[PDB]
Design a protein around this nucleic acid. Structure first.
Lengths: 109, 97, 75, 83, 95, 95, 109, 83, 97
DNA sequence: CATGCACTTACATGCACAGGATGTATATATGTGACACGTGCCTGGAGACTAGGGAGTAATCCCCTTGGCGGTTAAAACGCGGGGGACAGCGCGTACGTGCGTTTAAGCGGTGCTAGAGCTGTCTACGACCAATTGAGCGGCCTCGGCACCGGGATTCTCCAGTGGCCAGTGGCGGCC
DNA sequence: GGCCGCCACTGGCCACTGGAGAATCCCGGTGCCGAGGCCGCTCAATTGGTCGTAGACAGCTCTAGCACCGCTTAAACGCACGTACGCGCTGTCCCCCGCGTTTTAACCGCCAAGGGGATTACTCCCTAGTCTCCAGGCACGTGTCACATATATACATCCTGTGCATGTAAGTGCATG
């Protein structure tokens, strides 16, 4: 009578919810109609960027010898990638701190 | 003689410390008190989530810190190592306020 | 009127006698304390000190020209 | 209940701490009250926006959601508070 | 009794264990990620809506989203995101 | 003949004459005026859409726009705009 | 037996088109519904802003003894009002030039 | 057919005129080429977006409102050319 | 004897002139050449409405002029009157470019 | 008669003010086109009705916020030497403003011609919409190991007492006149 | 015999060095509470099918952009040359900083009140949508005076030549050694 339900995220094979993002765009007042591949494309690019920043966070935590990522790792990761840095130059992280950075003449001699 | 560090050495040490550190630098209670005080000026009997106060503290500290890196850029640009009131005035004007 | 600025300068350099020579700002404050309108006579003091340096009566310690420290001759 | 001089509640060593996190090596003595005024002007901007949001919500309880709305409206978006 | 609230924690958890099985996470870092995904989603959606208005197109397709991410995301991030989304929409098209 | 392109010339011309009967207008300053009015309209409309999104409201009322007038328009201009818009709202309420 | 076609801008005593702004808000995709008085309020606010900026422009043109509004007068008007300048700090003007501004140290003794 | 050097088309006297409009009375010689690089950087920053709008419009010819969209995207909103 | 103004006098005179004037300070056709050259680096055979080239123009000198008042305030902040590219780098970095 | 001092006199130098040049400011002339206004029109705003649903409002409760005491220090504050840094002054050597002749290329303007922006019939892909259903995603709970805290070494950096080298000051010696 | 130059000694200053002392990290051990993982629910994502319609395409057109070509003149360009400007040196005062001591209030911990955020229920006010209609503004067209440009004249300003006050140096007569 009816086939087993297969999710569109599974049909794409990506982890972000296609149906949730499509519902958000339907109720977010951006267009009267949305092409079917558009939220899939959105979920894909979101999962790519979250994946890469998670690589950066995991590398930062492993450099800090910590198993779990912290907002300081997020600060250190997001400020040392220039595309990400100017992507979020005006975006602020809770309890992130700052980069270790000292101007040259501040040092002695 | 008693030990005494030369000026700037402890300053550089605490620079390294607070750049390493992540915590808020101002006390929680007088900050919340001042936030309630100034918010009372617009409309009366306002209640505050503690999360809102902490988030405002975070944003204010970050905004101030970025203002001081701009001030540091101005001061090193002015060939000085001591920040000056005209440096903050300049940085505020360059940012567009 | 009174004496020219040269007696004022040599009195300023003979007043203190540190290991290093007296400086421009120190001698200006010395003549301000002794009594002279140093604010409009900066060029006058510069030319007087340079002329008296050329006489060999004063030797400039570290600076060049009118800057630096200034001290009296050997004898 | 009624308080007056809590701009002085941002104490001078706290401003020194912010400056050391800001990489300032030397601070003039005239700096602290100026920075107090600056953080003030900034704060009544953001809380005036927050109060406007809150009265628009028909609430007298200020939420951090309203705060992050106010900060991103000034182009100063903050992460980590439910946005 | 409570009300259900949306968050992106579990999908980011699958992504994290996909990229780093050995690495944990703090929950406030997840709050920062939730602000991240909501903010970037809102940016792309607003850009897509304004682009759809510019060409008077009442439907936003993956071409529009591609245009928007090319606008906002710079270069290397842009080209790899374009590649990932292109592969995703292609394998969805085969599905 | 071509397609109609709506512009703001006649309305701004009328308000210009009622504030200054004596003076004239240049058309590229009028292009600036179209850009200005469209810009502020877009800003306030986007802010109102954001506010209704936050309060889960499907309907934009003048309360939302009035709030946005507090938000964007600075100070004394905002109190003035509340005054004129409020009395205009009451007049239209009286049909 | 229809009523005579009366206009909503006249109903609010306004010059800006209530119907056009209402149509733009309906098709601008900002919400699914809009209140009746909301475009009235919006048109009133826009009319007030345009009225004050045109008055400032006319005063500026009178100062430069020209009978027609020039965008130089628009630049002089916007940059000399503090709340307007705060509204339009990041706005680029066509043919505006700048304010006549010379720093004090740039002038000779 | 192709072009290789038009950055020198922004001549030193034109830059001097701009700095006089900027209120600069004295200009070092090192200024001009560095400012050429800065203005150039601004040019690809706007024109990459402009090309993106143009191709997304499926047009081969660049139109002005696309430039308007790109500039207000960069927070540099231009009046007098919309529509 | 042929007259010669002292330095800065003429410079301040065209400062007053160009602050008074609104007309465009850039030769139009070299600017158009540079626009087409840079545009060809992203897409070949691009064609331009002249109005688009104009809009790009006033956007360009608007950014450039505002940069120069920023750098001028930086330079007088540095107690100098001659601008140097370090001032421009300072202004770009403080603006977050 | 010589010599120091004071007095007088001449010359160098900085400051002030008049005078010309000149670029900008101020007065008509004009002819032009941008601007402003009359006109056809059609399409977009408005009038009447409807349907239905989103928002306004009552009730409640509970959870979150507010209000209050008391140790407990860390932090704030005060004070004080004292080094380091802002900053004034000057010299000075330059690089850039200013001026003027040249070349060039920017601009005007005029023709040709075409890609291509853009407008309009068509029809179909596609996407929103409605009924069902479920399983994945979220509330709840538990527990446990990553992680916070602490205490003892090891390290590490840094400042300060000696440490020798260098340079100039200084006295003594030998030769010379 | 005294004077002068030379030579050798010596003291102070400046870069080098080892060690001490305090800060900082690191390693090991301990508890402790958020991560996260499992369990139960539910609601919303999916499936399927339909209707309508959005937009891609075909095709055409006319228009604005691109090219070119000649003329012209102002702008750029480049060289000369003076001057003012960065800026490095020196120094000098004084301003925060490190290092303590006192103080104080922040914070944590705990406890009680209640208030309004939020949630559900009910309702009806309002507004999107549809049909009809007509007039408001827009494209088009066309006259017309505001002003851009041109020309003549006035004044502000700016540099500069000259004239004055003042500081300084030199000569010399006179009183005296």
């Amino acid at each position: 009578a009816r086939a087993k339900a297969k999710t569109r995220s599974s049909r794409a094979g990506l982890q972000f919810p296609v149906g949730r993002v499509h519902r958000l765009l339907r109720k977010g007042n951006y267009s009267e109609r949305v092409g079917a591949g558009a939220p899939v494309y959105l979920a894909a690019v979101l999962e790519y960027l979250t994946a890469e920043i998670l690589e950066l966070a995991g590398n930062a935590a492993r450099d800090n010898k910590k198993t779990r990522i912290i907002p300081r790792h997020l600060q250190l990761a997001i400020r040392n990638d220039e595309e990400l840095n100017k992507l979020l130059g005006r975006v602020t992280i809770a309890q992130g701190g700052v980069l270790p950075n000292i101007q040259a003449v501040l040092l002695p001699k | 003689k008693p030990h005494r560090y030369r000026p700037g050495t402890v300053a550089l040490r605490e620079i390294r410390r607070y750049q390493k550190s992540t915590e808020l630098l101002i006390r929680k209670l007088p900050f919340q008190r001042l936030v309630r005080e100034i918010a009372q000026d617009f409309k009366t009997d306002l209640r505050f989530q503690s999360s809102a106060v902490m988030a405002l503290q975070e944003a204010s500290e970050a905004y101030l810190v970025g203002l001081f890196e701009d001030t540091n850029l101005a001061a090193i640009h002015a060939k000085r190592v001591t920040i000056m009131p005209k440096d903050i005035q300049l940085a505020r004007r360059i940012r567009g306020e | 009127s009174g004496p020219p600025v040269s007696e004022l300068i040599t009195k300023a350099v003979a007043a203190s006698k540190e290991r290093s020579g007296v400086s421009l700002a120190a001698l200006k404050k010395a003549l301000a304390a002794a009594g002279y309108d140093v604010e409009k006579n900066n060029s006058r003091i510069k030319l007087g000190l340079k002329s008296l340096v050329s006489k060999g009566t004063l030797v400039q310690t570290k600076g060049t020209g009118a800057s630096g420290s200034f001290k009296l001759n050997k004898k | 209940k009624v308080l007056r001089d809590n701009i002085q509640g941002i104490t001078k060593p706290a401003i020194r701490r912010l400056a050391r996190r800001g990489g300032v090596k030397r601070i003039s003595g005239l700096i602290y009250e100026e920075t107090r005024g600056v953080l003030k002007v900034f704060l009544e901007n953001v809380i005036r926006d927050a109060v406007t949001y809150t009265e628009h919500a028909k609430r007298k309880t200020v939420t951090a959601m309203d705060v992050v709305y106010a900060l991103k409206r000034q182009g100063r978006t903050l992460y980590g508070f439910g946005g | 009794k409570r009300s259900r609230k949306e968050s992106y924690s579990v999908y980011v958890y699958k992504v994290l264990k996909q990229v780093h099985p050995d690495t944990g996470i703090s929950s406030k870092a997840m709050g920062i990620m939730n602000s991240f995904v909501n903010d970037i989603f809102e940016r792309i959606a607003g850009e897509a809506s304004r682009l759809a208005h510019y060409n008077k197109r009442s439907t936003i397709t993956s071409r529009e989203i591609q245009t928007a991410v090319r606008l906002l995301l710079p270069g290397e991030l842009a080209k790899h995101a374009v590649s990932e989304g292109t592969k995703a929409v292609t394998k969805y098209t085969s599905a």
